[PDB]
């Protein structure tokens, strides 16, 4: 803390080096697939357009 408060050299020129750490990326379930009252209507449209296209 005393060295950090030293105004001699702030090391602002030096960017923070994070090569020693291995960042991890986590995957999450897509929120667009949640079967909500709004998506049910969306599927009904696609399910019906498919029938028309083939019909």
């Amino acid at each position: 803390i005393a060295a950090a408060k030293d105004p001699k050299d702030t090391f602002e020129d030096i960017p923070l080096d994070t090569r020693h750490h291995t960042f991890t990326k986590k995957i999450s379930f897509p929120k667009e697939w949640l079967l909500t009252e709004e998506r049910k209507k969306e599927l009904e449209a696609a399910r019906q357009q498919a029938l028309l296209k083939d019909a």
């Binding site: 379930f29 697939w33 949640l34 079967l35 909500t36 696609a46």
Partner: protein, 52 residues
């Protein structure tokens, strides 16, 4: 007669087999069900939902 009823009760086999029923896979409030499969050394978790 009561005599035959008693002697016959001694020949009954009161053995009950063990019951092991699997728990049914539920469906989340968002309509996604999780199934689990395995193979040589792998394990999978599939979330199946109504979609395209």
């Amino acid at each position: 007669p009561q005599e035959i009823k008693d002697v016959l009760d001694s020949f009954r086999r009161n053995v009950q087999p063990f019951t092991n029923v699997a728990k049914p896979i539920p469906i989340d409030q968002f309509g996604r069900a999780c199934g689990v499969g395995k193979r040589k050394a792998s394990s999978a978790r599939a979330f199946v939902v109504e979609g395209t």
